[PDB]
Every structure is written in structure tokens, then in C-alpha cells.
Design a protein around this ligand. Structure first.
Ligand code: C5P
Ligand code: C5P
Lengths: 204, 214
């Protein structure tokens, strides 16, 4: 439950070469990488084992699983079989959909992160209003890992009060007052010098 | 579209999926595929369905990310050959619009998922269903995918989206479903049948007897 330097690289690139280049350059500073469907749909799910075998990265699949229970189970099993250490799941489809993911994780010895809220434009339409109930639902389903919205620390304070001191929270300095790790993408992966960018961030 | 019947190819092994789809091709030309098959076999399987059978493919990916990422998922998906992609409306208007913009650029289609009917859907989705469908109408969404249960829910959805929108829904069927949906989605009853082709052929006959206007 410990992320190296409390810094997670959000690898949102879709090209294998740039993805691997950047990951290899920041491995002396970061050991946890979050990847999404753009990369895996473009390069194949086998890229996950590549990240792990090549660099020893812990991999969080940010797939925002949001289907019915039976399908969620299949997606999680396929993702864990490919090597993901954790998978991010939506809470809006309800408790049984989340439970299906948690069960595959228990069975396979992996982890599920519950997405409690989103902060992009439009998230205020339906997600914002359900966020507190979704976080509380997570606590009651035994969820121990949460992903918070890209927002000001004040709001993470509220989420932290709901999930408790023992849960693990990750979110896109002040943020680290409430989150266990911060997620950084572009400022690192588009940098001409990814290593220097990561090293600078860790300076805090 | 062909025969108002869409095949839900939910099997995870490449062999059976390709086999079954090929056997029913005479009656069905539109197939819906989800993440399990794609993540296990690769996105290349989409081009395979299209190149080999001339199938129209609907990627049931229920896209639910932020606008920028939704754009990339859609682009990756249409590039692989999908004719349309299913997108969640709960994340909001901007996330749905990002998908519509990529579909517009590439000449493809977006299907908005407005509600679900599985256990737990009542916690947050059910209460937002009508508002999400109306959001779709406001965004100019023209294709919708309905829930799997309760035809009383289809009549409501049809009422909100209007007669000019296209609606596909899982399954007194097929008659019951086609009273509101333009096409029915059928999976197990076809792909688990001993003679898939026979199952599809049968279903198509029933639909023929309905004499559905427009
Ligand atoms: N509006 C936004 C933008 C980005 N993010 C998250 O932050 C991560 C990294 O973002 P950056 O590339 O902008 O640093 C993304 O992968 C995404 O999960 C978010 O949660 N909301
Ligand atoms: N419980 C279920 C079962 C199936 N379905 C939908 O109906 C499609 C085909 O279902 P059948 O196999 O039951 O005909 C599935 O691919 C899925 O999208 C659902 O929404 N809820």
C-alpha cells in the first residue's frame, strides 16, 4: 500500500515507444503507473506485462469499469490476468457492480480503487450529487482504495473524513495533506526531460 | 439494421465468436461486441469481423471517462473498425459531446446509454434516466440503447427521444420490444443455440409477421 515517493505517473500516451521511454526514464523516482484504455486498446493488453517485466512498475488500470456485474467480472478477470495490480471502477452503476469487481480482486489477490467523483465539466450534472453516497457505499462494501477528483484540497478533506484514516486515497503539496499519493501526467510524460520533471515534483 | 436484429456476441473465445457470427450472417449483419472479447483477443478482432463478414460493429464499451480521454478511446475504437460506440451519459454533457465530436470527424456513430436495469441500477442510475435521455436530446444524440428489462421503460424512453431517434434494446418478444425499439439485441438465445442460424432465422420470421410501420 506504499507508492514510491507518493507520486503516480498517469501514462496517458497511446504510443508504446513514448510510453516505455518515459516510464523507463522516471523509474528511479516512480514505481506506480496508471494506464488507460487509449494505450491498451492501441497497443494491446500485453503491454501491461511489458511495463511490469521491463521496469517492475505496479500497474493501475484506469478503466472506469461501469457495466453490469457479470460483465464487470469478466473485464476485471481479463485485466488482472494481463498483470494489472489494481483496476479503477465507477460507483454510479451501484453496489452489485462494484462488488463483482471486488470479488475478482479478492479471488486473484489484486485491488480495486473506487472512483467517488469526477471534476471535469459536466460532472456537476449527475456525479457531483451522488459523490458522498458513492463514497459511503464504498466504505460499506469494504473498499479500501479510492481515487479522488482533480480538485482543491478542501474537498479531499471531506472525502477523507468519509473514508477514514486507514483507507488509501490517490488524486490528481496541499493535496498530499489528504491523499496518500498524487497523480501526475502531462507535466512528466510530455516533458523534454521526464526524469528532471519527476525529480522536481518529488522536491516537496 | 438488417432484419431489425442485432447479435450480442458476448462469448470470450475468438473461435466460437467468429464461428457463430459467420453462421448467422445471412440474417444478421450488425454485431455488438464488448470489452471482455476485445481485451482478451485484441482490438484487431473488430477489423476481423468487418473484413471477414462485412459486419457492422457496435463497440459496447460504455465509455465513461473525462472528455479528453473519451475522445482518445473513441478514436482508437473507430480506427480499429467499429461503426458505432456505446457511451454512458452519467458522466455528463461534455463527456458525451467529446464522443460525438470524434464520431462526427470520422463519420461514425455514438449510441447513448441512458439507463441500466441490473441489481443496483436503482441506487443512482434509475433516478437519473429521464434527465440523461433529455440531455442526449439536447446534445443532438440520435442513437440510443435501452435497458434490458421492463417494456414499460421503453415506452417512456421512446416518448423522450421522439420518433426520429434510433433505439436498440435487448429483449412476448420480439413483438413487445419492437413496439418501441427500432431493433432488438439478442445474445444467448442465438449464440448458445445448437443451430444459431436456425435461432436467428426463427426470430427474423416473427419480426416479419409484425408488419412494423416505418
Ligand atoms: N479534469 C481532469 C483532468 C485530468 N484528471 C486526472 O489526472 C490524470 C493526470 O492528469 P495530467 O496529465 O493533467 O497531470 C489523468 O490521467 C486523469 O485521471 C482528472 O481527474 N480530471
Ligand atoms: N442481465 C443482463 C443481461 C444481458 N443484457 C444485455 O443484453 C445483451 C444480450 O443479452 P442476452 O444474451 O440475454 O440476449 C447483452 O450483451 C447486454 O448488453 C443486460 O443489459 N442485462
Amino acid at each position: 500500500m506504499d507508492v514510491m515517493n507518493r507520486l503516480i505517473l498517469a501514462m496517458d500516451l497511446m504510443n508504446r515507444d513514448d510510453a516505455l521511454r518515459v516510464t523507463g526514464e522516471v523509474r528511479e523516482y516512480i514505481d506506480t503507473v496508471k494506464i488507460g484504455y487509449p494505450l491498451v486498446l492501441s497497443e494491446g493488453m500485453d503491454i501491461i506485462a511489458e511495463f511490469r517485466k521491463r521496469f517492475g512498475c505496479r500497474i493501475i488500470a484506469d478503466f472506469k469499469v461501469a457495466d453490469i456485474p457479470e460483465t464487470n467480472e469478466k473485464i476485471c478477470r481479463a485485466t488482472f490476468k494481463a498483470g494489472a495490480d489494481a483496476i479503477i471502477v465507477h460507483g454510479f452503476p451501484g453496489a452489485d457492480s462494484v462488488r463483482a469487481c471486488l470479488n475478482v480482486a479478492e479471488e486473484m489477490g489484486r485491488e480495486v480503487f473506487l472512483l467517488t467523483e469526477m471534476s471535469h465539466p459536466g460532472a456537476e450534472m449527475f456525479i457531483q450529487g451522488a459523490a458522498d453516497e458513492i463514497a459511503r457505499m464504498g466504505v460499506d462494501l469494504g473498499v479500501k482504495n479510492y481515487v479522488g477528483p482533480s480538485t482543491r484540497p478542501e474537498r479531499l478533506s471531506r472525502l477523507r473524513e468519509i473514508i477514514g484514516q486507514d483507507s488509501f486515497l490517490i488524486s490528481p503539496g496541499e493535496t498530499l495533506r489528504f491523499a496518500d499519493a498524487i497523480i501526475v501526467g502531462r507535466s512528466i510524460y510530455l516533458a523534454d526531460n521526464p526524469a528532471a520533471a519527476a525529480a522536481g515534483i518529488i522536491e516537496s
